[PDB]
Design a protein around this ligand. Sequence first.
Ligand SMILES: *[C@@H]1O[C@H](CO)[C@@H](O[C@@H]2O[C@H](CO)[C@@H](O)[C@H](O)[C@H]2NC(C)=O)[C@H](O)[C@H]1NC(C)=O
Ligand SMILES: *[C@@H]1O[C@H](CO)[C@@H](O[C@@H]2O[C@H](CO)[C@@H](O)[C@H](O)[C@H]2NC(C)=O)[C@H](O)[C@H]1NC(C)=O
Ligand SMILES: *[C@@H]1O[C@H](CO)[C@@H](O[C@@H]2O[C@H](CO)[C@@H](O)[C@H](O)[C@H]2NC(C)=O)[C@H](O)[C@H]1NC(C)=O
Ligand SMILES: *[C@@H]1O[C@H](CO)[C@@H](O[C@@H]2O[C@H](CO)[C@@H](O)[C@H](O)[C@H]2NC(C)=O)[C@H](O)[C@H]1NC(C)=O
Ligand SMILES: *[C@@H]1O[C@H](CO)[C@@H](O[C@@H]2O[C@H](CO)[C@@H](O)[C@H](O)[C@H]2NC(C)=O)[C@H](O)[C@H]1NC(C)=O
Ligand SMILES: *[C@@H]1O[C@H](CO)[C@@H](O[C@@H]2O[C@H](CO)[C@@H](O)[C@H](O)[C@H]2NC(C)=O)[C@H](O)[C@H]1NC(C)=O
Ligand code: NAG
Ligand code: NAG
Ligand code: NAG
Ligand code: NAG
Ligand code: NAG
Ligand code: NAG
Ligand code: NAG
Ligand code: NAG
Ligand code: NAG
Ligand code: NAG
Ligand code: NAG
Ligand code: NAG
Ligand code: NAG
Ligand code: NAG
Lengths: 445, 502, 138, 49, 149, 49
Amino acid sequence: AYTNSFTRGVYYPDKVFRSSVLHSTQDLFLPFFSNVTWFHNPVLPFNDGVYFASTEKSNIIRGWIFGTTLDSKTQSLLIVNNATNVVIKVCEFQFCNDPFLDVNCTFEYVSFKNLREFVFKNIDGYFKIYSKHTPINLVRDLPQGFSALEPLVDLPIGINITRFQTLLAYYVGYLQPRTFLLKYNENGTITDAVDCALDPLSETKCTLKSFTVEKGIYQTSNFRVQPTESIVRFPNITNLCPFGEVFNATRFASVYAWNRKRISNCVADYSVLYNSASFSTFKCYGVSPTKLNDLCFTNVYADSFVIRGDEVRQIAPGQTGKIADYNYKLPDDFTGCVIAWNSNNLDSKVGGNYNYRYRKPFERDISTEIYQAGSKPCNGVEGFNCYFPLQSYGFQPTNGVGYQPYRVVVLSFELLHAPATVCGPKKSTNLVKNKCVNFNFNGLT
Amino acid sequence: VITPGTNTSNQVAVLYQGVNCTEVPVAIHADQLTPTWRVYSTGSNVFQTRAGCLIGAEHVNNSYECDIPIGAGICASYQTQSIIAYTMSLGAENSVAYSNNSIAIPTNFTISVTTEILPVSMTKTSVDCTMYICGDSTECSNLLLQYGSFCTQLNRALTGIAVEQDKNTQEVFAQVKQIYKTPPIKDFGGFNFSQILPDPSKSKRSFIEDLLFNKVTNGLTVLPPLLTDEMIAQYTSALLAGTITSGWTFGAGAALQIPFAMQMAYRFNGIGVTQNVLYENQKLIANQFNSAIGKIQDSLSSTASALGKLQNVVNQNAQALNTLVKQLSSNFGAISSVLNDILSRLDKVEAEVQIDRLITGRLQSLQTYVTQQLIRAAEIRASANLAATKMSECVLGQSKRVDFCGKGYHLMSFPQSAPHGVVFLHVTYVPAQEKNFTTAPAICHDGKAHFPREGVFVSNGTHWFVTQRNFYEPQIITTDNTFVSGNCDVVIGIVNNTVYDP
Amino acid sequence: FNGLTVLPPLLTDEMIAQYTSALLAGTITSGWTFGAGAALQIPFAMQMAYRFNGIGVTQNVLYENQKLIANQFNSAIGKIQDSLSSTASALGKLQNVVNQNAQALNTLVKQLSSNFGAISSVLNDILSRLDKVEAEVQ
Amino acid sequence: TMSLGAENSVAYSNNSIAIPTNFTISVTTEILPVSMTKTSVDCTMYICG
Amino acid sequence: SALGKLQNVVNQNAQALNTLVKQLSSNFGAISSVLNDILSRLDKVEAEVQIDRLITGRLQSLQTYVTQQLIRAAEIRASANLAATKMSECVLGQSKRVDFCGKGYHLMSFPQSAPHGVVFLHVTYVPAQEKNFTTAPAICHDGKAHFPR
Amino acid sequence: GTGVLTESNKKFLPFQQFGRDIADTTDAVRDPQTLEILDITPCSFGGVS
Ligand SMILES: *[C@@H]1O[C@H](CO)[C@@H](O[C@@H]2O[C@H](CO)[C@@H](O)[C@H](O)[C@H]2NC(C)=O)[C@H](O)[C@H]1NC(C)=O
Ligand SMILES: *[C@@H]1O[C@H](CO)[C@@H](O[C@@H]2O[C@H](CO)[C@@H](O)[C@H](O)[C@H]2NC(C)=O)[C@H](O)[C@H]1NC(C)=O
Ligand SMILES: *[C@@H]1O[C@H](CO)[C@@H](O[C@@H]2O[C@H](CO)[C@@H](O)[C@H](O)[C@H]2NC(C)=O)[C@H](O)[C@H]1NC(C)=O
Ligand SMILES: *[C@@H]1O[C@H](CO)[C@@H](O[C@@H]2O[C@H](CO)[C@@H](O)[C@H](O)[C@H]2NC(C)=O)[C@H](O)[C@H]1NC(C)=O
Ligand SMILES: *[C@@H]1O[C@H](CO)[C@@H](O[C@@H]2O[C@H](CO)[C@@H](O)[C@H](O)[C@H]2NC(C)=O)[C@H](O)[C@H]1NC(C)=O
Ligand SMILES: *[C@@H]1O[C@H](CO)[C@@H](O[C@@H]2O[C@H](CO)[C@@H](O)[C@H](O)[C@H]2NC(C)=O)[C@H](O)[C@H]1NC(C)=O
Ligand SMILES: *[C@@H]1O[C@H](CO)[C@@H](O)[C@H](O)[C@H]1NC(C)=O
Ligand SMILES: *[C@@H]1O[C@H](CO)[C@@H](O)[C@H](O)[C@H]1NC(C)=O
Ligand SMILES: *[C@@H]1O[C@H](CO)[C@@H](O)[C@H](O)[C@H]1NC(C)=O
Ligand SMILES: *[C@@H]1O[C@H](CO)[C@@H](O)[C@H](O)[C@H]1NC(C)=O
Ligand SMILES: *[C@@H]1O[C@H](CO)[C@@H](O)[C@H](O)[C@H]1NC(C)=O
Ligand SMILES: *[C@@H]1O[C@H](CO)[C@@H](O)[C@H](O)[C@H]1NC(C)=O
Ligand SMILES: *[C@@H]1O[C@H](CO)[C@@H](O)[C@H](O)[C@H]1NC(C)=O
Ligand SMILES: *[C@@H]1O[C@H](CO)[C@@H](O)[C@H](O)[C@H]1NC(C)=O
Ligand SMILES: *[C@@H]1O[C@H](CO)[C@@H](O)[C@H](O)[C@H]1NC(C)=O
Ligand SMILES: *[C@@H]1O[C@H](CO)[C@@H](O)[C@H](O)[C@H]1NC(C)=O
Ligand SMILES: *[C@@H]1O[C@H](CO)[C@@H](O)[C@H](O)[C@H]1NC(C)=O
Ligand SMILES: *[C@@H]1O[C@H](CO)[C@@H](O)[C@H](O)[C@H]1NC(C)=O
Ligand SMILES: *[C@@H]1O[C@H](CO)[C@@H](O)[C@H](O)[C@H]1NC(C)=O
Ligand SMILES: *[C@@H]1O[C@H](CO)[C@@H](O)[C@H](O)[C@H]1NC(C)=O
């Protein structure tokens, strides 16, 4: 059952004096001319905040209860105007739906031809109360016209209200986020208001910041047609990518002569990698790792090697040194992920797995030819100025972690340019035309 | 949103610019996702136009004058009531009664008085850009030093504007070499200037200057004009008193006294009306002029909307300064817009990385304000140069430039001062009550062809006369009103008559 | 279509054509008089005698040469057609106003392609590729 | 406080006129600016050196 | 001091260029205002943040100069249109527009050239040595009113 | 803030505690000990010429 709200339910939004000014604000308010629920008790949803009002003089409407359950399980609001005072408490109360007669406690406080009206909201755990009292004669509907509700209570009580009820002629409506123009008079009091969305004239009043507007034509808004649906158009590839074969291989190559596997014409679920607790690092650069399952690519390259844990700092964009410029260097704009784990449980020997060894962007020299590091022609033999280029990793079973073996896979991603070729697990929709739509073609949103 | 004005009615019509009505009430208006622009499939009626989809208005086929413009020849108005929309009419259509031997000549005239209003000066303004940007916080003031000349070239730009506004005000009003002042007697031949001369009881402005002065309504500083409103009112007094007592003569050497009726006889002789027409009609002319000044008092009392060109200068300065002050509250990406929050909450490297956003935003905001004032001041200077020209030509003289000094033939004009501007009362002669006549280019007598020395030949259908071009005054066709050239052979449309010899 | 919009003028070209007709028809039938007040009709050759006194030529010089003067004028208007039909570059003062506004808009639109130091000129790339805390820097 | 100039009661009446009996030819200089210095800045060289 | 109009047009362009040059030395929040310092002291990945501060400052400095020149050029264009008008109306003719071609009644004017400008000698007639007389608008003879031609 | 504190007649409502200009600058406050209203007036500044 329902009634018209007219222009009721505005309250002073702040403790700020303003003189003779048409101030403007955006906040939770009861929208003008909205439908208000009508009563002659039930438990009601609280939503984002409440307007409540009643015709009264008996004080049969003694107060309210608010919370999630309204009984036993939690600290919960009890409010009672007991004719001696407004009494408030927030206890873990043990009372049913009607504890009144026939007609923990983290906080507590003590203060028809008539109507009283109230607004209740909670923000940041501060529960807040606004009020007004009036005489009336037309009690047969909510009173037409305007007067401002004003604050009473503002308390950090923290309770998550979702339900409430009355305690034993009243009406209930809900606050909504809206923009208003508020007429402060030459005495510091609100005396009128405009609900800016109500009609194009209210948008015009709010555009001009005035209650009167001249004859004319005024721009208030921009119109845009909205998407009616969403579309996914993707490759219809059925094959699934070889990541087990990439990551769980018997032995990775040396860092000086690194391996690379192409991944192509398959669907890739990177959550299989990204969710895995196994990886000591998952450093992604030109793309965020959370997004990988929603993108699409022309190719993916898994470069891979085993290397000593200390040198991971050179496996980054634009770096230099023996691990980078003499083994494997990334470009400055690397679009990809560095994925690695400590592999001491497999790559470590009983004293030194010396088969793993160390010495441009995606450069590689497989040669072990002597550094002719001076004037003497070394002719394949070491000496002064004459050195074998590949130092050997001493991977024993109990090295310090910087000295342990790590297994590395670096994924480099080829962006969409040519057609979709490695792609996320997205499912293609039907195609719609001539309507406005959202669309996604191979990740092109 | 097209509106009758809330004074008159609460109905509105709405135009969706460039959009097609097959989309409009089927979109973010009506039957789709619809934030703010709440639903109606038709608000009363829907009507496509070249300007866009028009909703709520009523299409009409009568072409009225344009009340509210829409675009592409469409206008809207509130009428028997609804908002009607129509293709506008440019004006009533008049087929002029032209034929090769017919002429119309006025038999009577009306003096008219018309008001023209021009801006002359802006609010003189200057800003302490270090106080605006940093509010006396030392850490911010030290960061700002890295930007060099910016908070000094801005002051130099605003100083150029502030000095120019005194120059504009001086160039318009200071045309007069001495403070000429009015005689104690008021025998100006029947004319009554008492509404535009000084009121000595008040500041000593005229009555009409007090209407004008009534009707017009941080780190920042506002500076006074060089000349006070009391000084400007003395120059308008002097310019007016010179014009009344001495005609244009005070505009070229020293003022020469002349009786005002004889000065008006020269003004008439300047527009090709023979001066006897003035002295024979002097009481009627004075009654028309005295009446016309009264209508100006009513016009400026009846609405405040007349001074829109002056009022807009005051509004544009307020609009810009409020915007410049509000721009202090913006974040520009910083963790707070209040500088002491950043300084209290963050370590010095984290604070300076944030504060340089507020400096960057506030500096980009302050350059934007100063650039608007530089452009707006050139627009006001173009008006002040026109006002100096209007005063030089119309007030100190009698300009023959058509429609320059009000509509109709120009006689004289009176300056009156107003806030941030000037108001001219242009006095003009309009010919009013014409008759048709038959006419001919020449008259043939004893074979000699006669032409009129001044004025034109006319006939009432039985007798021929000569008369002046701007006021019907028939006279006998004599050797003294005419001159000879050639004979009847050469001229097209010549007529026979006697030409009398005294 | 890129967030740009263009609006119609208030007066359409056939309304301007009514004003240029009306000013011309007033001038031909009534001299300057339709500026100062009502259009007083006057014979057009006699209006030209009033124009000649205005430049210090005694009006009999018009009437004694009226056929010649009409021929010189009728001939001169004909040459204006040939000048305008020949030489489009005579309208440089109007064409310039078109060409400047077209290049101003095309410069404003081409600037959407500039990176400004972000990962892409296409805003939906950043929003697709980067998670929100990283995207907001770009 | 600045003076606006001398003040002067013109001797008006319904029957009095003043007529000049002599003249001065007078020469008045007027000066107007007409052009700026034609200037160009290569932004590629100004910004990036 | 009479040529203050022309000397100002020389001064304003000098102050604009001196300001535009001095701004090259400002830091704009980079570690040096001299580009070769940053290029020689830093690796490119560090240098690019510093150089982008210098680009940002020097570009906004240059936009400010060009915007002032556009507005100043419109002021001088309006003066050149006025000068071109005075030349046609005062030199090639005899103007009757009060105070346009110099104060007094206008006879003629002579142009003379000047650096960045033009100078007119306006030649004018100014009346002097007035005498008072009694006057009347008209004279009556044989009961008929006579007016002067 | 910084300013000249001054006695004032701006009649705040019982729950109102400070007040603002059109451009939102604070220009009045209640004293929380003696519950009357002060106007806040900015301390003077200007050009030395
Ligand atoms: C192609 O050959 C060149 C040598 O001719 C390789 O150059 C390497 O360049 C990096 C820096 O860019 C140096 O750190 C290395 O020392 C160079 N290698 C040698 C052996 O001197 C280049 O890497 C080769 N291209 C590819 C794709 O690897
Ligand atoms: C010229 O027009 C004026 C009005 O501008 C005429 O004066 C009016 O004449 C009628 C009687 O015909 C009177 O009732 C009015 O009171 C007069 N008005 C004024 C202001 O005096 C005048 O009669 C016309 N002159 C001629 C000769 O027709
Ligand atoms: C000049 O006209 C003014 C009005 O324009 C006359 O003064 C007004 O006269 C009426 C009627 O006597 C009064 O109601 C007003 O109060 C007067 N106003 C003022 C300011 O005095 C004035 O009498 C006329 N003077 C002459 C010489 O005719
Ligand atoms: C044309 O004008 C003439 C001169 O005013 C008119 O002739 C006079 O007419 C009156 C009677 O209306 C006589 O008393 C005069 O004696 C006539 N004067 C002469 C010199 O003849 C003539 O009537 C007018 N014609 C028309 C059609 O109005
Ligand atoms: C003007 O008067 C002359 C006579 O004084 C008219 O000339 C005569 O007109 C008749 C009739 O057309 C001819 O038969 C004669 O041969 C003409 N004589 C001459 C010398 O040309 C003349 O027609 C009159 N013009 C007008 C327009 O009325
Ligand atoms: C005035 O000059 C015009 C030309 O500008 C002369 O008109 C031409 O005269 C010749 C004969 O001399 C004809 O062949 C042409 O056809 C005429 N041109 C036109 C447009 O009609 C005119 O003759 C000169 N008049 C005098 C008095 O010398
Ligand atoms: C809700 O309000 C509208 C008017 O705003 C009214 O037409 C409608 O009947 C109301 N809803 C109910 C359930 O009455
Ligand atoms: C109201 O509440 C107080 C305690 O807060 C209690 O002492 C008092 O008796 C109550 N009064 C009534 C009339 O119920
Ligand atoms: C008060 O809180 C404690 C936990 O802090 C809880 O065990 C207890 O049940 C609460 N009191 C009541 C009356 O429920
Ligand atoms: C409020 O409810 C939310 C879940 O809806 C919960 O996360 C939050 O901790 C609750 N806060 C309090 C203070 O009870
Ligand atoms: C302000 O309130 C007082 C009483 O407190 C009243 O006398 C006065 O008229 C009011 N003024 C306005 C502008 O409301
Ligand atoms: C590697 O093998 C284990 C089982 O031995 C499996 O859980 C894991 O998913 C495999 N790795 C990948 C990348 O799938
Ligand atoms: C609307 O304004 C006009 C003046 O602009 C006024 O005449 C009219 O009385 C006003 N309408 C009403 C209903 O008062
Ligand atoms: C408006 O849209 C319809 C299709 O819905 C089209 O047929 C019509 O031509 C359009 N009208 C205009 C004026 O563009
Ligand atoms: C307008 O005129 C047309 C004919 O020109 C007619 O068909 C139409 O019904 C008229 N519309 C209105 C609203 O009068
Ligand atoms: C002049 O005469 C024509 C008819 O010849 C007539 O239509 C027109 O209305 C008349 N005009 C005046 C001003 O009397
Ligand atoms: C006036 O025009 C008509 C028609 O063109 C012509 O018959 C008549 O002779 C002309 N009269 C004069 C005086 O030009
Ligand atoms: C006119 O003035 C000149 C000097 O300008 C003087 O020499 C001459 O005598 C005067 N003539 C008369 C008639 O006053
Ligand atoms: C003209 O006469 C008046 C008195 O009628 C006198 O005040 C004035 O000084 C005289 N001027 C000259 C130049 O003689
Ligand atoms: C604070 O105490 C003083 C006296 O010590 C008293 O005058 C004042 O009114 C008190 N204010 C409040 C708000 O208690």
